[PDB]
Structure 1
Amino acid sequence: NLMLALLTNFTLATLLVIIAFWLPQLFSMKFFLVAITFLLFDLEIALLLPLPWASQTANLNTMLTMALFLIILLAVSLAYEWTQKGLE
């Protein structure tokens, strides 16, 4: 069971907190541009995720031109990051 496996880890993690809790008795907007680019790149990663699991039944010649195409534009988005990104 996956449900039994996950819940056992969290319940033991909660118990460790109580041990320390119960027993003893006596600005800058330049960071934002980095965070946004993380999200926009990971969505291109999300489109490029199926590649090892997808390419099994589909035609290779039709895929080859389209598979590289996403990575090329992923570099063009980084090419726009070279024309003055900032001090970061």
Structure 2
Amino acid sequence: MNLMLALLTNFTLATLLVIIAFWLPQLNVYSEKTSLPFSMKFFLVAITFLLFDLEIALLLPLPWASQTANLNTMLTMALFLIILLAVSLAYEWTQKGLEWTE
């Protein structure tokens, strides 16, 4: 109940400041003013982050995984995942995927 009440305050306060910051200026009554080409490299960096992010999701439970009695199995699987994550980086690296020159 505290967390729900904590999130409500932070965004309600942020909401109040945004609206008054939009309206408090609008009382000076100032004079009336009366006055992209797709890049495939930006997409590739966004996709690569996603696939690395999904690998990070699998690595997040490692602190709990080290409390098990099958450490020989757990350490093998943990290092396998991290290594395969390195292989992906090695693959993109060697295929000019990390470059920015057109």
**TM-score over 0.5 for the alignment?**
yes
Identity of aligned residues (%): 100
Q: How far apart, in 2, do the equivalents of 1:19 and 1:56 lie?
A: 52
TM superposition outliers: structure 1 runs of 4+ over 3 Å: none
What's the TM-score, normalizing by structure 1?
Answer: 0.86
Say if 1:86 and 1:79 are closer, same or farther in 2 by CA, change over 3 A. closer
Structure 2: runs of 5 or more not aligned: 27-37
Q: Greater relative contact order (Cα 8 A, min sep 6): structure 1 or 2?
A: 1
Deviations 1:45-80 (A, max 9, x none): 100100112321342111111110001110110111
Structure 1: runs of 5 or more not aligned: none
Q: CA RMSD in A?
A: 1.8
Say if 1:24 and 1:72 are closer, same or farther in 2 by CA, change over 3 A. closer
* Segment of structure 1 superposing worse, 56-65 or 43-52: 56-65
What's the TM-score, normalizing by structure 2?
Answer: 0.76
How far apart are 1:86 and its partner, in Å?
4.8
How far apart are 1:18 and its partner, in Å?
1.5
| Count of aligned pairs | 87
